[PDB]
Amino acid sequence: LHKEPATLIKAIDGDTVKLMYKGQPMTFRLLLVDTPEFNEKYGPEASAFDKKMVENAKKIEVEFDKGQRTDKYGRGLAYIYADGKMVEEALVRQGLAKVAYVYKGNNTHEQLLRKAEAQAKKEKLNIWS
Ligand SMILES: Cc1cn([C@H]2C[C@H](OP(=O)(O)O)[C@@H](COP(=O)(O)O)O2)c(=O)[nH]c1=O
Ligand SMILES: [Ca+2]
């Protein structure tokens, strides 16, 4: 797997972000996680967390897994990194996202993310409180 350049266009919610990728505006849906919608408990906190990581990042990168790269709504499916920190891992570790939507050719970071989620659970943090 490799990391590719991208730039922030704008933060959307806890697991969606608008980026410029190969010079094209594009909605990215984070692989392997689910954040609450904004209108649900921990949604605003998840939005705020993601926003902070991406807006304060000097460098954003996009990393596709080996399976499909666009979903049925035309969103990009990637892991997102902000100055080398994976956004999915930070959210899950904070208990603002669940490991979710784990499909077959697109699950390289599943174990890593489940570890993060185990700690958040043991802390009874946010979603797990
Ligand atoms: C994260 C992810 C979501 N999706 C689709 C499945 C879900 O479809 P349905 O909308 O039909 O339930 C939807 C959930 O995204 P959101 O959690 O952003 O709504 O996005 C994928 O197809 N692949 C993925 O890797
Ligand atoms: Ca969601």
Swiss-Prot record:
Residues 109-125 have a biased composition (Basic and acidic residues). It comes from the Bacteria. Ca(2+) binds at D15, D34, T35. Disulfide bonds: none annotated. Transmembrane segments: none annotated. The active site is at R29, E37, R75. It is found in: Secreted. Residues 109-129 are annotated as: Disordered. This is Nuclease A. It comes from Staphylococcus aureus.
